[PDB]
Design an enzyme around this catalytic site. Structure first.
Site, PDB file in Angstrom:
ATOM      1  N   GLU D  66       0.456   7.013   7.009  1.00 49.80           N
ATOM      2  CA  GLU D  66       0.850   6.147   8.110  1.00 49.80           C
ATOM      3  C   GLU D  66       0.605   4.685   7.751  1.00 49.80           C
ATOM      4  O   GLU D  66      -0.350   4.344   7.047  1.00 49.80           O
ATOM      5  CB  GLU D  66       0.081   6.525   9.381  1.00 49.80           C
ATOM      6  CG  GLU D  66       0.338   5.628  10.588  1.00 49.80           C
ATOM      7  CD  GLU D  66       1.775   5.687  11.073  1.00 49.80           C
ATOM      8  OE1 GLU D  66       2.347   6.796  11.110  1.00 49.80           O
ATOM      9  OE2 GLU D  66       2.336   4.622  11.411  1.00 49.80           O
ATOM     10  N   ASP D  94       0.298  11.728   8.836  1.00 51.46           N
ATOM     11  CA  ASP D  94      -0.479  10.493   8.863  1.00 51.46           C
ATOM     12  C   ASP D  94      -1.366  10.323   7.635  1.00 51.46           C
ATOM     13  O   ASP D  94      -1.363   9.257   7.015  1.00 51.46           O
ATOM     14  CB  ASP D  94      -1.332  10.439  10.137  1.00 51.46           C
ATOM     15  CG  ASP D  94      -0.491  10.317  11.389  1.00 51.46           C
ATOM     16  OD1 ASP D  94       0.343   9.387  11.453  1.00 51.46           O
ATOM     17  OD2 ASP D  94      -0.660  11.150  12.307  1.00 51.46           O
ATOM     18  N   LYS D 120       2.703  18.747  19.544  1.00 51.99           N
ATOM     19  CA  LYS D 120       2.593  18.437  18.123  1.00 51.99           C
ATOM     20  C   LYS D 120       2.734  19.694  17.272  1.00 51.99           C
ATOM     21  O   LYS D 120       3.364  19.663  16.209  1.00 51.99           O
ATOM     22  CB  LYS D 120       1.263  17.740  17.838  1.00 51.99           C
TER      23      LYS D 120
HETATM   24  C1  LIG Z   1       9.670   5.687  19.007  1.00 51.86           C
HETATM   25  O1  LIG Z   1       9.518   6.220  17.723  1.00 51.86           O
HETATM   26  C2  LIG Z   1       8.709   5.453  16.873  1.00 51.86           C
HETATM   27  C3  LIG Z   1       8.011   6.083  15.858  1.00 51.86           C
HETATM   28  C4  LIG Z   1       7.206   5.341  15.005  1.00 51.86           C
HETATM   29  C5  LIG Z   1       6.431   6.036  13.887  1.00 51.86           C
HETATM   30  C6  LIG Z   1       6.767   7.526  13.841  1.00 51.86           C
HETATM   31  N1  LIG Z   1       5.971   8.211  12.838  1.00 51.86           N
HETATM   32  C7  LIG Z   1       4.692   8.868  13.090  1.00 51.86           C
HETATM   33  O2  LIG Z   1       4.164   9.387  12.168  1.00 51.86           O
HETATM   34  C8  LIG Z   1       3.972   8.934  14.447  1.00 51.86           C
HETATM   35  N2  LIG Z   1       4.493   8.332  15.665  1.00 51.86           N
HETATM   36  C9  LIG Z   1       3.737   8.435  16.945  1.00 51.86           C
HETATM   37  C10 LIG Z   1       4.281   7.803  18.225  1.00 51.86           C
HETATM   38  C11 LIG Z   1       3.897   6.516  18.569  1.00 51.86           C
HETATM   39  F1  LIG Z   1       3.040   5.818  17.761  1.00 51.86           F
HETATM   40  C12 LIG Z   1       4.383   5.936  19.730  1.00 51.86           C
HETATM   41  C13 LIG Z   1       5.250   6.648  20.545  1.00 51.86           C
HETATM   42  C14 LIG Z   1       5.631   7.935  20.201  1.00 51.86           C
HETATM   43  C15 LIG Z   1       5.145   8.517  19.039  1.00 51.86           C
HETATM   44  F2  LIG Z   1       5.519   9.786  18.695  1.00 51.86           F
HETATM   45  N3  LIG Z   1       2.440   9.151  16.995  1.00 51.86           N
HETATM   46  C16 LIG Z   1       1.911   9.752  15.787  1.00 51.86           C
HETATM   47  O3  LIG Z   1       0.879  10.321  15.823  1.00 51.86           O
HETATM   48  C17 LIG Z   1       2.664   9.651  14.503  1.00 51.86           C
HETATM   49  O4  LIG Z   1       2.139  10.239  13.348  1.00 51.86           O
HETATM   50  C18 LIG Z   1       7.128   3.970  15.206  1.00 51.86           C
HETATM   51  C19 LIG Z   1       7.859   3.409  16.245  1.00 51.86           C
HETATM   52  N4  LIG Z   1       8.617   4.145  17.037  1.00 51.86           N
HETATM   53 MN   LIG Z   2       0.166  10.714  14.245  1.00 56.74          MN
HETATM   54 MN   LIG Z   3       2.459   9.076  11.786  1.00 60.27          MN
END
Ligand SMILES: COc1cc(CCNC(=O)c2[nH]c(-c3c(F)cccc3F)nc(=O)c2O)ccn1
Ligand SMILES: [Mn+2]
Ligand SMILES: [Mn+2]
Ligand SMILES: C[C@H](C[C@@H](C[C@H](C[C@@H](C[C@@H](CCN1CCCC1=O)N1CCCC1=O)N1CCCC1=O)N1CCCC1=O)N1CCCC1=O)N1CCCC1=O
Ligand SMILES: C[C@H](C[C@@H](C[C@H](C[C@@H](C[C@@H](CCN1CCCC1=O)N1CCCC1=O)N1CCCC1=O)N1CCCC1=O)N1CCCC1=O)N1CCCC1=O
Ligand SMILES: C[C@H](C[C@@H](C[C@H](C[C@@H](C[C@@H](CCN1CCCC1=O)N1CCCC1=O)N1CCCC1=O)N1CCCC1=O)N1CCCC1=O)N1CCCC1=O
Ligand SMILES: C[C@H](C[C@@H](C[C@H](C[C@@H](C[C@@H](CCN1CCCC1=O)N1CCCC1=O)N1CCCC1=O)N1CCCC1=O)N1CCCC1=O)N1CCCC1=O
Ligand SMILES: C[C@H](C[C@@H](C[C@H](C[C@@H](C[C@@H](CCN1CCCC1=O)N1CCCC1=O)N1CCCC1=O)N1CCCC1=O)N1CCCC1=O)N1CCCC1=O
Ligand SMILES: C[C@H](C[C@@H](C[C@H](C[C@@H](C[C@@H](CCN1CCCC1=O)N1CCCC1=O)N1CCCC1=O)N1CCCC1=O)N1CCCC1=O)N1CCCC1=O
Ligand SMILES: C[C@H](C[C@@H](C[C@H](C[C@@H](C[C@@H](CCN1CCCC1=O)N1CCCC1=O)N1CCCC1=O)N1CCCC1=O)N1CCCC1=O)N1CCCC1=O
Ligand SMILES: C[C@H](C[C@@H](C[C@H](C[C@@H](C[C@@H](CCN1CCCC1=O)N1CCCC1=O)N1CCCC1=O)N1CCCC1=O)N1CCCC1=O)N1CCCC1=O
Ligand SMILES: COc1cc(CCNC(=O)c2[nH]c(-c3c(F)cccc3F)nc(=O)c2O)ccn1
Ligand SMILES: COc1cc(CCNC(=O)c2[nH]c(-c3c(F)cccc3F)nc(=O)c2O)ccn1
Ligand SMILES: COc1cc(CCNC(=O)c2[nH]c(-c3c(F)cccc3F)nc(=O)c2O)ccn1
Ligand SMILES: COc1cc(CCNC(=O)c2[nH]c(-c3c(F)cccc3F)nc(=O)c2O)ccn1
Ligand SMILES: COc1cc(CCNC(=O)c2[nH]c(-c3c(F)cccc3F)nc(=O)c2O)ccn1
Ligand SMILES: COc1cc(CCNC(=O)c2[nH]c(-c3c(F)cccc3F)nc(=O)c2O)ccn1
Ligand SMILES: [Mn+2]
Ligand SMILES: [Mn+2]
Ligand SMILES: [Mn+2]
Ligand SMILES: [Mn+2]
Ligand SMILES: [Mn+2]
Ligand SMILES: [Mn+2]
Ligand SMILES: [Mn+2]
Ligand SMILES: [Mn+2]
Ligand SMILES: [Mn+2]
Ligand SMILES: [Mn+2]
Ligand SMILES: [Mn+2]
Lengths: 181, 181, 181, 181, 181, 181, 181, 181
Positions: D66, D94, D120
């Site tokens: 991440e 991550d 998840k």
């Molecule tokens: C709207 O989509 C996105 C996605 C990303 C990165 C995605 N990749 C991940 O790995 C990711 N994302 C999230 C997450 C969040 F941080 C906020 C809202 C919803 C989510 F699921 N939680 C995690 O735990 C994780 O590992 C960045 C911007 N916008």
């Molecule tokens: Mn995550």
């Molecule tokens: Mn992530």
């Protein structure tokens, strides 16, 4: 300047200090990093692997021989011998293990670790010097199956080696690099 | 300025902060590093050895007495005594071991460690103060065969000591230095 | 400016950041470090002791409550309570032990540790909060004889405390400081 | 600029480098941190938690996936797979645990950890990838009850999570943030 | 350590590098800054004034002689003479003016500038060396009424001199300092 | 903590050192930056304007009185008076002009510069002190139409003032700020 | 390592970055700084003089050609020619004057400036390239008596040159250095 | 990742901060520096030229509009207009001249400066905005033949532009770059 693009990748992929040490090492041996750019990538790789290797283990565990100037590296190699009693190796090794009381020869090859270990073992006559080979595919081979460091430290080196291979394959430089060793 | 070339080697071989501490120590005792240049190399050597010694072991293990000013070093020597109960040593020691509850007198000699340890032990009357001698050849001798630190930490000090000897022998300054103690 | 010379000693004896935190703490409570200079030396001392205390043990072992602003210190005190389940203390403590799951009240006194511990224990009603007292003479007293840290870490704090006392005695400021608590 | 005050709090509450990484991550996915400010606070929170998580344990224990760019994160994910033999996960995880040989999916939720863990776990098909959920209330839930890190490291993350919640509640931004996930 | 409180003020009032240069200068002449503390304040003052003086004017205008070691200061004094043709002064001056081609002797006195200028002019036989006196009251006197620098640069030095006097008067150290020259 | 969002904007809009100086200035006068947040924005603004003002002109041109502690600011105000001969002002000014030999009172108002200049001129009885007013709209008014600095330096201050106004209007904080002076 | 003591003086007398640039320049031309130590001192001297020379004048006045690698220095030499229209010099010059639109060849000699200027002028065929010679005695000779920089900037270079000569004479290395050019 | 080698050259040729600003600028407009790599080299070039341009002249002479985010750049453009009275330009300019009271549009073209100036002048309707074009060949064209800066500052920009062209020609990337505008 020839404008080789393997050169630009080496400068973007590796640390500025590692690049500078590799350049001094090549120029000392009468080699141009701008011309022999496949080597240039290899001394940088070998240098980095040697540095992460010494980063494993305890703080005062390893003495770094690789990266120094030839005269200074042989001076430290001496002092280690005249204080521990280990035999002076014929060729300059990479590290010294204060924990196991032996010099380490680190190898990074583009072929199978079996052949390179054989060439490394046939080169040195001092069988006391420990040999540890790494490959860009993720293999490793050490003397007496004694891999010195922890699994996590060796895994980090393997991951970095495969990342370098991917970055060159993306730039179509991997085929020339593998067929240069 | 006399232009002694032992002086230029000391400034190139040792750390700038170690050189400055050695200069203040010599001037405090009415000695010129530009004139008594063989000593100048010795306080730098003794200072560095004391510093790597404290670098061994845990973080809060050692209290550094050497390198401080005379009044401040005696102030810390006191505070250690009035808090642990150890007897106040007659002469200023180099370190204090919070792990073993004793002061350490570090020695760096150009002859056999046997004689220097005898002179160091005859000087101090407080037999509680621990004595640890190092030699430029790679030998060491400690009180009750208790060498305090790990083997790897002591080996690093020996390697550095022999490296210093080699660098002076290359500049033809080793013969005068050995015949000055 | 009154020109108190206890003030100049505090600025020369203690760390600039520790002095700044002590000044903000006193001014927040409506106290002038330039006027109540004996206190000024005490908050600096108590602050430093709290910092070396947290330096002992593992990296993530202690949460530092002392030194923060009142609102922020109570915010962190809360978050610790609402996540571990410990009862909210009535008065602001100094540290929190993630290893033993308890708040620590650090004391630095100029008299015998027996009385100060009694005053500290009578003040707090939450008997769960751990109490650890230090003295300028080299004594210490902790709840249930549980001194939390290693002996070497506590010895370093005692040595520093006695060094501060000596430096004030040399400037004839110790008699006024002891007769101010 | 809309002038959202959740935005000003995120810039004051979180580290400048964490804010910059969250901004690049959102913009890469076609999201404005100035408009979707509730998310903006969440990627910063998730980013920080991921960083403290990797700060727990040994130095070379975790590989941070991440925070990297999408292409580079998938490159490192590959190299880990082609060197250890772990199956390539369908979605970007991550962290990677060099000690347990598994990828870690870190979750930070505003509701009960039970539901978020279910979402998840239903998302990923590779059941080998480890899941570790945290909540703003102080709860946590990990795969096979294997919480990977020490209790003190996880407690620090919980404390920070509750501190963030308090700071938003003080600015009347907590109600909107909780009702946005 | 004597615990003189003029000493603590000097360490709090002046720059750490200026204090260190004054200490080396006094010790070189066989003087203790801990004992002759009124002088200690004076070399620091004279040193600072010399430094702000060279800060006036252009970048390459002044060569700083004061603050160097005796041998090095005389070496630079020579090189200036053997390149410009100016006569070698009998006593070590403070600065050299590359713009006016003359050495400058900077004075800082506690009495009227008239007497001190006379003593400074009677000491040197080389009438070519320029003399510039400053006083703690705000007066100044230069050779041939040629004050070298701008009015604003000289005014800054006078302001600093009077600030130092006020800070000592607040600590009741001004009366002893004035009656020591 | 009240959670005022004017506070978060001030911390994001202004320099961390300027924020810290404004906080110390307000607390010294018994004011809370967390409660009187409209003022908090004003001392930061006035502080920054004072700093850019001194950045105009030559290096040694201005002495900065604003931002110092009350006792130290009056000490420097004195030293300037006892060295140049200027009359001691009744109220603490902001700067001193070594080029024009006068103190400068810098004003930053939310209304027309005409009224604020009148209030500033009626407050001080020392008509020698120069007055320079700035407005958030882009106006300025100085004593005897002598604007001291260059047009480009004053234009930079006006641009910054209008940028601050825009950033607050975007966050709907401008209406409350203007109706608070 | 030969242990030449001219080498130790060069490392103590000159800047670490200047020493590194001189080493790369010598090794590029197949010369050992450890063997040809008299030269080693000369490239360092010539390098420093070139750097102080460019430090004179305005900020964007000079383009530094000396010190770069051969290919990069010729690349910048080109770009200057293809943008200003100046003829390409046959040999690599040291600087370029954006104010006078000409390349500068800086000379540092151990004999009279008359001969060295003749050798420098006979070497280059492009009479447009400006020549500026310096001597260790304090002399200088420039093309058309146009000395480019101010007198104070050139005087600083002469002073430094004579200081270097004195330091070598003190170490008995000046006689060999002068009889090597 | 496509592995374009123009990308590796841009990262090696330009400053890391300039590369980061160019990446944010391209991504904000929905462009990939990894795909549109010829542009990627152009925004970096245009960015650097804008920065050296503002480095010419006095310290407070220029306000930098290029490189900021779109909302912030328009905020500063406003504040300049509402304080000086200049008309708001239709398109975002690069700089603002506090000395000449006008916005500057900086152009960097691969063809003749005549055409690009015409396209730049036809785009903007505000004829008050100053236009300054640069070419990779060494030409320049400014509005009303008013080139704003000194000749030496503009010459440095031309030299850098031709150096960039040479470095790309050496890597065989110049032909594609010129045929992309
Ligand atoms: C709207 O989509 C996105 C996605 C990303 C990165 C995605 N990749 C991940 O790995 C990711 N994302 C999230 C997450 C969040 F941080 C906020 C809202 C919803 C989510 F699921 N939680 C995690 O735990 C994780 O590992 C960045 C911007 N916008
Ligand atoms: Mn995550
Ligand atoms: Mn992530
Ligand atoms: C000592 C110094 C250089 C050391 C080489 C080595 C580099 C080390 C740097 C560390 C910090 N990390 C880790 C994160 C990034 C970084 O930067 N790592 C390890 C990983 C890559 C890297 O760079 N180490 C180890 C001690 C401190 C240090 O820097 N070398 C060079 C050869 C001999 C030697 O001991 N020396 C010695 C004199 C000249 C010089 O340069
Ligand atoms: C504390 C400070 C100086 C310490 C001396 C000692 C030096 C230490 C520096 C470390 C970092 N390393 C290691 C790599 C290179 C380097 O630089 N090492 C050890 C090896 C050589 C060296 O240099 N240590 C230990 C604590 C931090 C520090 O610096 N000293 C001086 C005498 C008393 C003391 O505690 N102090 C204290 C006040 C004055 C001063 O200077
Ligand atoms: C985190 C930071 C300050 C910390 C206080 C504490 C200070 C620590 C500094 C260390 C490095 N050492 C050791 C050698 C000299 C030095 O300097 N030590 C310990 C000994 C004396 C000292 O100074 N620590 C611990 C974490 C890093 C740090 O600095 N504090 C202040 C109260 C809350 C807190 O966690 N913070 C947090 C936000 C404001 C601020 O300033
Ligand atoms: C490596 C580097 C950034 C790392 C992210 C991470 C940040 C780390 C910083 C540490 C120091 N602490 C701790 C105290 C405050 C601070 O600052 N922590 C942990 C807590 C919050 C924080 O900030 N780490 C870990 C290694 C060193 C480092 O900085 N990242 C970013 C994603 C990938 C990665 O490894 N990289 C790599 C290339 C780009 C870049 O930026
Ligand atoms: C060169 C260096 C030290 C210089 C002394 C002098 C100090 C200068 C520092 C400046 C920056 N400012 C100004 C703001 C605060 C600060 O710090 N000022 C001037 C005001 C007080 C002060 O401190 N200067 C001038 C050049 C750079 C420098 O630092 N000296 C010491 C004697 C000889 C000499 O040239 N040297 C040279 C080798 C040893 C050493 O230390
Ligand atoms: C001297 C020091 C602080 C100074 C205040 C002032 C701040 C200055 C900083 C400069 C650099 N720039 C410019 C770019 C960003 C930056 O940072 N500017 C000007 C613009 C905003 C800003 O911040 N100046 C001027 C001299 C050096 C310095 O820093 N002050 C504070 C009050 C008295 C004083 O002279 N002092 C003195 C002791 C305590 C302290 O902190
Ligand atoms: C630009 C950089 C190096 C420059 C060389 C030159 C060095 C300069 C350093 C200054 C600061 N001072 C002055 C006080 C001490 C110091 O340190 N001076 C001048 C005196 C001695 C010295 O050292 N300059 C000038 C611009 C900034 C800089 O550093 N060079 C090297 C050859 C080409 C070039 O422009 N570069 C460019 C890329 C590689 C590198 O290293
Ligand atoms: C202010 C800051 C960045 C500035 C951009 C500009 C960069 C400047 C850096 C200087 C130092 N030099 C010169 C030698 C190498 C170097 O590094 N130069 C000029 C040449 C190339 C370069 O890099 N300047 C000018 C003021 C200080 C500074 O850095 N910018 C970015 C857009 C707006 C702005 O004013 N800001 C402002 C907030 C975000 C940020 O980053
Ligand atoms: C062409 O010869 C050289 C040699 C050096 C250093 C030699 N000293 C070593 O110690 C060394 N060299 C190599 C190595 C390499 F890095 C690239 C190609 C072939 C190699 F054998 N692998 C090691 O593992 C190693 O320890 C530098 C430049 N050119
Ligand atoms: C000529 O006298 C001095 C003494 C000091 C410091 C004395 N204090 C010590 O503690 C000390 N000195 C020495 C030592 C040495 F470093 C060189 C020669 C002879 C020695 F004995 N070896 C130690 O091991 C030691 O602990 C400094 C200058 N001159
Ligand atoms: C006059 O009141 C205050 C209080 C504070 C902080 C209070 N908060 C604590 O937590 C605190 N205070 C003290 C303490 C002291 F440092 C000096 C004198 C008396 C004391 F009790 N000893 C501790 O151990 C402690 O934890 C700051 C200024 N003035
Ligand atoms: C007791 O003798 C010393 C001399 C030095 C340096 C001498 N060299 C100078 O150059 C020097 N000294 C003094 C000066 C002073 F700073 C304090 C008291 C009396 C003085 F004359 N005023 C100057 O202006 C000056 O230029 C250091 C220590 N002790
Ligand atoms: C409530 O009283 C205070 C005063 C100070 C500093 C006073 N000293 C000055 O010098 C000062 N103050 C102000 C000023 C202001 F910044 C905000 C509101 C009203 C003001 F008059 N404008 C100036 O221009 C100025 O020079 C700090 C905190 N609170
Ligand atoms: C594809 O559109 C964009 C635009 C921007 C910034 C636009 N704003 C300017 O101000 C701007 N742009 C350009 C420019 C360029 F750098 C490359 C190609 C074409 C151009 F016109 N030259 C200037 O001189 C200029 O001032 C960033 C990314 N993509
Ligand atoms: Mn090797
Ligand atoms: Mn190897
Ligand atoms: Mn000792
Ligand atoms: Mn010893
Ligand atoms: Mn407390
Ligand atoms: Mn306490
Ligand atoms: Mn003087
Ligand atoms: Mn004001
Ligand atoms: Mn030359
Ligand atoms: Mn633009
Ligand atoms: Mn443009």
């Amino acid at each position: 300047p020839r404008g080789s693009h393997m050169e630009d990748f080496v400068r973007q992929c590796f640390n500025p200090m590692i690049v500078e040490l590799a350049e001094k090492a090549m120029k000392e041996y009468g080699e141009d990093p701008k011309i022999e750019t496949n080597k240039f990538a290899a001394i940088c790789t070998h240098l980095e692997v040697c540095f992460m290797y010494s980063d494993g283990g305890s703080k005062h565990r390893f003495e770094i021989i690789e990266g120094r100037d030839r005269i200074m590296a042989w001076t430290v190699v001496n002092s280690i011998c005249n204080t521990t009693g280990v035999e002076k190796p014929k060729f300059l090794p990479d590290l010294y293990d204060y924990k196991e009381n032996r010099f380490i020869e680190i190898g990074v090859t583009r072929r199978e670790v079996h052949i390179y270990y054989l060439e490394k073992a046939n080169k040195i006559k001092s069988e006391k010097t420990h040999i540890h080979i790494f490959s860009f595919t993720g293999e490793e081979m050490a003397t007496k199956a004694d891999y010195t460091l922890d699994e996590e430290s060796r895994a980090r080196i393997k991951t970095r080696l495969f990342t370098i291979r991917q970055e060159m394959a993306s730039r179509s430089l991997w085929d020339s690099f593998r067929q240069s060793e």
